[PDB]
Design an enzyme around this catalytic site. Structure first.
Site, mmCIF file in Angstrom:
data_model
loop_
_atom_site.group_PDB
_atom_site.id
_atom_site.type_symbol
_atom_site.label_atom_id
_atom_site.label_comp_id
_atom_site.label_asym_id
_atom_site.label_seq_id
_atom_site.Cartn_x
_atom_site.Cartn_y
_atom_site.Cartn_z
ATOM 1 N N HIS A 108 5.219 20.775 -12.688
ATOM 2 C CA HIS A 108 4.546 19.520 -12.982
ATOM 3 C C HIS A 108 3.028 19.707 -13.014
ATOM 4 O O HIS A 108 2.467 20.614 -12.388
ATOM 5 C CB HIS A 108 4.965 18.428 -11.998
ATOM 6 C CG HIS A 108 4.792 18.793 -10.564
ATOM 7 N ND1 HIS A 108 5.555 19.753 -9.931
ATOM 8 C CD2 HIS A 108 3.986 18.290 -9.623
ATOM 9 C CE1 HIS A 108 5.187 19.845 -8.657
ATOM 10 N NE2 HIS A 108 4.216 18.978 -8.454
ATOM 11 N N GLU A 136 5.931 23.167 -6.204
ATOM 12 C CA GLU A 136 5.476 22.951 -4.844
ATOM 13 C C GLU A 136 5.629 24.271 -4.104
ATOM 14 O O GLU A 136 6.295 25.173 -4.603
ATOM 15 C CB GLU A 136 6.241 21.782 -4.214
ATOM 16 C CG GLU A 136 6.078 20.462 -4.955
ATOM 17 C CD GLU A 136 4.671 19.893 -4.917
ATOM 18 O OE1 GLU A 136 4.078 19.812 -3.816
ATOM 19 O OE2 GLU A 136 4.177 19.531 -5.976
ATOM 20 N N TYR A 147 -4.650 11.384 -1.481
ATOM 21 C CA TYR A 147 -5.234 11.915 -2.700
ATOM 22 C C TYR A 147 -5.943 10.799 -3.457
ATOM 23 O O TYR A 147 -5.297 10.094 -4.234
ATOM 24 C CB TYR A 147 -4.182 12.518 -3.635
ATOM 25 C CG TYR A 147 -3.582 13.839 -3.179
ATOM 26 C CD1 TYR A 147 -4.289 15.031 -3.293
ATOM 27 C CD2 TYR A 147 -2.302 13.893 -2.644
ATOM 28 C CE1 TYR A 147 -3.735 16.240 -2.897
ATOM 29 C CE2 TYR A 147 -1.744 15.093 -2.232
ATOM 30 C CZ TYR A 147 -2.459 16.271 -2.359
ATOM 31 O OH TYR A 147 -1.908 17.458 -1.956
ATOM 32 N N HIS A 165 2.053 23.432 -11.582
ATOM 33 C CA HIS A 165 2.531 24.046 -10.349
ATOM 34 C C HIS A 165 3.994 23.696 -10.087
ATOM 35 O O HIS A 165 4.546 22.763 -10.668
ATOM 36 C CB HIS A 165 1.682 23.641 -9.136
ATOM 37 C CG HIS A 165 1.836 22.213 -8.701
ATOM 38 N ND1 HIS A 165 1.502 21.137 -9.499
ATOM 39 C CD2 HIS A 165 2.254 21.687 -7.538
ATOM 40 C CE1 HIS A 165 1.719 20.010 -8.840
ATOM 41 N NE2 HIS A 165 2.205 20.316 -7.653
ATOM 42 N N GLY A 198 0.461 18.785 4.790
ATOM 43 C CA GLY A 198 0.803 18.528 3.402
ATOM 44 C C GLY A 198 2.241 18.904 3.063
ATOM 45 O O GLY A 198 2.773 18.415 2.068
ATOM 46 N N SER A 228 1.351 11.866 -0.339
ATOM 47 C CA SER A 228 2.257 12.927 -0.731
ATOM 48 C C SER A 228 2.719 13.726 0.480
ATOM 49 O O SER A 228 2.038 13.727 1.506
ATOM 50 C CB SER A 228 1.580 13.818 -1.719
ATOM 51 O OG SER A 228 2.426 14.897 -2.088
HETATM 52 NI NI NI Z 1 2.931 18.603 -7.019
#
Ligand code: NI
Ligand code: ZN
EC number: 1.14.11.66
Length: 345
Positions: free
Chosen positions: A268, A182, A169, A180, A162, A280
């Protein structure tokens, strides 16, 4: 970008070919100040022919999203359900119980989401290791973006799922991702392969500490336990809450086929409109390295990126100082990545 509004770019195929470069360009326009931005890839570009054959794909550990709380403040407990196929997930997504409600404009659906997210716990087919890109596609291939993040893998031989490898997703109505940044405050890229839209909320990096100060107050226990409790990816806060408490923020709706880019320390959150598939992973620019040095990690859960690689190579002058721990750099979030000088001139 003084207003720090989310920005949308529509590159030509020429402008598009080089990821790192196009990122630098958008940073040259102040896109980073919003903390989030959209790239509409050219009409011709397509990462795959057709998504017809993927029903057999296995979601090993779906998560039932349980949302506890009220009054614009919620905690999301994600419960690992047993595995199921994409066929099986798809059926459930579209079921009359879970099917998206009827609406005309986003506004309508948003209200609905923030009213009913405690009722009818959705399942989210998240953290699915893999890519839906075709082997020959070199342009913005999330599988192999080739950023300076590749140094972690390249120098240590450490694969981080990831982070430097791609995730899939599969969302349904009301499946949510909590506020969050990243991991290691890296960048990230999200491509909505197909299906219904996904709305994004954003707080400017240069107002991220503000969000932390408020969130700590709201969940003081969580914060008293773990300084970086938001990294648990469990906290939901309402737009009307943010207005009440004067936290600057902006919204955007990702349509299928569009790219979304998150910037270092750009908070975000968002929710899926209906059954969809998003791909992602995380990535890096020179600018990030300092963010990486100064990131506030979760200590409270076991199971972290060596910055030594990055400071040595890209900040050799501050290597010894940083090792001595006396590097007191202050980050200015308005500043674009060094690589953007090209487009500033
Ligand atoms: Ni994110
Ligand atoms: Zn923690």
């Amino acid at each position: 970008n003084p207003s720090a509004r989310i920005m949308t770019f529509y590159p030509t195929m020429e402008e598009f070919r080089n990821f790192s470069r196009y990122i630098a360009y958008i940073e040259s326009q102040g896109a980073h100040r919003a903390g989030l931005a959209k790239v509409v890839p050219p009409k011709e570009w397509k990462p795959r022919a057709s998504y017809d054959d993927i029903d057999d794909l296995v979601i090993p550990a779906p998560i039932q999203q349980l949302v506890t709380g009220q009054s614009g403040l919620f905690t999301q407990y994600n419960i690992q359900k047993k595995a199921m196929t994409v066929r099986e997930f798809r059926k459930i997504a579209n079921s009359d119980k879970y099917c998206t409600p009827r609406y005309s404009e986003f506004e309508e659906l948003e209200r609905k989401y923030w009213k009913n997210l405690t009722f009818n716990p959705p399942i989210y087919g998240a953290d699915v290791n893999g890519t839906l890109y075709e082997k020959h596609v070199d342009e913005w291939n999330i599988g192999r973006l080739r950023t300076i993040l590749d140094l972690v893998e390249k120098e240590s031989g450490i694969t981080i799922e990831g982070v430097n490898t791609p995730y899939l997703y599969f969302g349904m109505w009301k499946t949510s991702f909590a506020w969050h940044t990243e991991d290691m405050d890296l960048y990230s890229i999200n491509y909505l392969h197909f299906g219904e839209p996904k709305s994004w909320y954003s707080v400017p990096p240069e107002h991220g500490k503000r969000l932390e100060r408020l969130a700590k107050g709201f969940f003081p226990g969580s914060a008293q336990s773990c300084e970086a409790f938001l990294r648990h990816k469990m906290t939901l806060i309402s737009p009307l809450m943010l207005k009440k408490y004067g936290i600057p923020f902006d919204k955007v709706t990702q349509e299928a086929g569009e790219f979304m880019i998150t910037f270092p320390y750009g908070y975000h959150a968002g929710f899926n409109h209906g059954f969809n598939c998003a791909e992602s992973t995380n990535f890096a620019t020179r600018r990030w390295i300092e963010y990486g040095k100064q990131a506030v990690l979760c200590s409270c859960r076991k199971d972290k990126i060596s910055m030594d690689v990055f400071v040595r190579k890209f900040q050799p002058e501050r290597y010894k100082l940083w090792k001595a721990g006396k590097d007191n750099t202050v980050i200015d979030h308005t500043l674009p990545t060094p690589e953007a000088a090209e487009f500033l001139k």
